[PDB]
Protein backbone atom coordinates (compact mmCIF):
# COMPACT_ATOMS: atom_id res chain seq x y z
CA UNK A 269 0.00 0.00 0.00
CA UNK A 270 0.92 3.65 -0.25
CA UNK A 271 2.94 4.74 2.76
CA UNK A 272 3.26 8.36 3.84
CA UNK A 273 6.43 9.30 5.75
CA UNK A 274 5.43 12.26 7.92
CA UNK A 275 7.76 14.13 10.26
CA UNK A 276 6.58 16.29 13.19
CA UNK A 277 8.99 19.13 14.05
CA UNK A 278 8.97 22.17 16.34
CA UNK A 279 10.45 23.79 19.45
CA UNK A 280 10.49 22.08 22.86
CA UNK A 281 7.15 21.56 24.59
CA UNK A 282 4.86 22.72 21.77
CA UNK A 283 2.94 19.43 21.69
CA UNK A 284 4.53 17.36 18.91
CA UNK A 285 4.00 14.15 20.90
CA UNK A 286 0.57 15.00 22.25
CA UNK A 287 -0.64 15.56 18.67
CA UNK A 288 0.89 12.28 17.49
CA UNK A 289 -0.53 10.32 20.46
CA UNK A 290 -4.01 11.85 20.09
CA UNK A 291 -4.05 10.73 16.47
CA UNK A 292 -2.61 7.25 17.00
CA UNK A 293 -3.93 6.18 20.42
CA UNK A 294 -6.81 8.58 20.98
CA UNK A 295 -5.85 10.20 24.31
CA UNK A 296 -4.29 13.39 25.72
CA UNK A 297 -1.00 12.96 27.53
CA UNK A 298 -0.70 15.46 30.38
CA UNK A 299 2.89 14.31 30.27
CA UNK A 300 10.16 7.74 18.27
CA UNK A 301 8.23 6.26 15.36
CA UNK A 302 4.56 5.36 14.89
CA UNK A 303 3.00 3.17 12.19
CA UNK A 304 -0.74 2.91 11.58
CA UNK A 305 -3.01 1.64 8.83
CA UNK A 306 -5.68 4.26 8.11
CA UNK A 307 -8.18 4.98 5.34
CA UNK A 308 -8.06 8.58 4.12
CA UNK A 309 -10.54 9.71 1.48
CA UNK A 310 -11.19 6.06 0.68
CA UNK A 311 -7.52 5.37 0.12
CA UNK A 312 -6.10 2.59 2.27
CA UNK A 313 -2.64 3.63 3.44
CA UNK A 314 -0.03 3.63 6.19
CA UNK A 315 0.97 6.68 8.22
CA UNK A 316 4.62 6.34 9.24
CA UNK A 317 5.12 9.26 11.60
CA UNK A 318 8.37 10.42 13.14
CA UNK A 319 7.86 12.31 16.36
CA UNK A 320 11.14 14.20 16.73
CA UNK A 321 12.88 15.10 20.01
CA UNK A 322 12.74 18.76 20.95
CA UNK A 323 16.39 19.19 21.91
CA UNK A 324 18.25 21.36 19.41
CA UNK A 325 20.98 18.74 19.44
CA UNK A 326 20.68 17.97 15.76
CA UNK A 327 21.48 19.66 12.43
CA UNK A 328 23.53 16.59 11.59
CA UNK A 329 21.13 14.51 13.65
CA UNK A 330 18.25 16.41 12.00
CA UNK A 331 19.41 16.11 8.39
CA UNK A 332 19.01 12.34 8.41
CA UNK A 333 15.30 12.27 9.22
CA UNK A 334 14.37 15.37 7.22
CA UNK A 335 15.83 13.71 4.12
CA UNK A 336 13.51 10.71 4.23
CA UNK A 337 10.44 12.63 5.36
CA UNK A 338 7.87 13.28 2.66
CA UNK A 339 5.79 15.90 4.41
CA UNK A 340 6.29 17.93 7.57
CA UNK A 341 4.10 19.19 10.35
CA UNK A 342 5.75 22.38 11.59
CA UNK A 343 4.28 22.92 15.04
CA UNK A 344 4.37 25.93 17.35
CA UNK A 345 2.25 26.76 20.39
CA UNK A 346 -0.03 29.81 20.39
CA UNK A 347 1.04 30.77 23.91
CA UNK A 348 4.68 30.62 22.87
CA UNK A 349 6.09 33.45 20.77
CA UNK A 350 9.59 31.98 20.57
CA UNK A 351 8.24 28.65 19.30
CA UNK A 352 6.50 30.64 16.53
CA UNK A 353 9.58 32.69 15.62
CA UNK A 354 11.56 29.42 15.55
CA UNK A 355 9.37 28.14 12.70
CA UNK A 356 11.48 29.97 10.09
CA UNK A 357 14.61 28.12 11.14
CA UNK A 358 12.87 24.74 10.76
CA UNK A 359 11.51 25.54 7.29
CA UNK A 360 14.87 26.82 6.02
CA UNK A 361 16.44 23.57 7.28
CA UNK A 362 13.88 21.34 5.57
CA UNK A 363 14.41 23.32 2.36
CA UNK A 364 18.19 23.04 2.56
CA UNK A 365 18.16 19.26 3.03
CA UNK A 366 15.44 18.48 0.46
CA UNK A 367 16.97 20.73 -2.21
CA UNK A 368 13.54 22.31 -2.73
CA UNK A 369 11.69 25.58 -2.33
CA UNK A 370 8.45 23.56 -2.30
CA UNK A 371 8.12 20.79 0.30
CA UNK A 372 4.74 19.43 1.46
CA UNK A 373 4.22 21.16 4.78
CA UNK A 374 1.50 22.39 7.13
CA UNK A 375 1.88 25.11 9.77
CA UNK A 376 0.12 24.02 12.99
CA UNK A 377 -0.63 26.37 15.86
CA UNK A 378 -1.15 23.98 18.77
CA UNK A 379 -2.75 24.47 22.24
CA UNK A 380 -5.62 26.54 20.85
CA UNK A 381 -7.64 25.50 23.89
CA UNK A 382 -5.62 27.96 26.00
CA UNK A 383 -6.91 31.52 26.60
CA UNK A 384 -3.47 33.01 27.31
CA UNK A 385 -2.36 33.31 23.69
CA UNK A 386 0.62 35.39 22.63
CA UNK A 387 0.55 34.54 18.92
CA UNK A 388 -2.51 35.80 17.03
CA UNK A 389 -4.15 33.70 14.31
CA UNK A 390 -3.84 36.43 11.65
CA UNK A 391 -0.09 36.57 12.36
CA UNK A 392 0.44 32.87 11.66
CA UNK A 393 -2.04 32.88 8.77
CA UNK A 394 -0.04 35.66 7.12
CA UNK A 395 3.17 33.69 7.66
CA UNK A 396 1.67 30.53 6.17
CA UNK A 397 0.47 32.57 3.18
CA UNK A 398 4.00 33.81 2.55
CA UNK A 399 5.23 30.19 2.53
CA UNK A 400 2.32 29.06 0.39
CA UNK A 401 1.34 26.43 2.95
CA UNK A 402 -1.90 25.72 4.91
CA UNK A 403 -2.40 26.98 8.45
CA UNK A 404 -4.39 24.88 10.91
CA UNK A 405 -4.98 25.43 14.65
CA UNK A 406 -5.11 22.36 16.89
CA UNK A 407 -5.59 21.28 20.46
CA UNK A 408 -4.18 17.87 21.36
CA UNK A 409 -6.23 18.31 24.56
CA UNK A 410 -9.67 18.69 22.98
CA UNK A 411 -8.61 16.89 19.77
CA UNK A 412 -9.77 19.89 17.71
CA UNK A 413 -8.18 19.97 14.27
CA UNK A 414 -5.89 16.99 14.91
CA UNK A 415 -7.09 14.74 12.07
CA UNK A 416 -7.46 17.91 9.99
CA UNK A 417 -3.75 18.74 10.26
CA UNK A 418 -2.41 15.25 9.51
CA UNK A 419 -4.91 14.57 6.72
CA UNK A 420 -4.28 17.96 5.09
CA UNK A 421 -0.59 17.03 5.10
CA UNK A 422 -1.31 13.70 3.38
CA UNK A 423 -3.31 15.57 0.75
CA UNK A 424 -0.46 18.05 0.23
CA UNK A 425 1.86 15.10 -0.45
CA UNK A 426 -0.72 13.63 -2.88
CA UNK A 427 -0.75 16.93 -4.81
CA UNK A 428 3.03 17.33 -5.00
Ligand SMILES: [Mg+2]
Nearest residue numbers: 284285320321
Ligand atom coordinates in the same frame (compact mmCIF):
# COMPACT_ATOMS: atom_id res chain seq x y z
MG1 LIG B 1 7.82 14.88 22.36
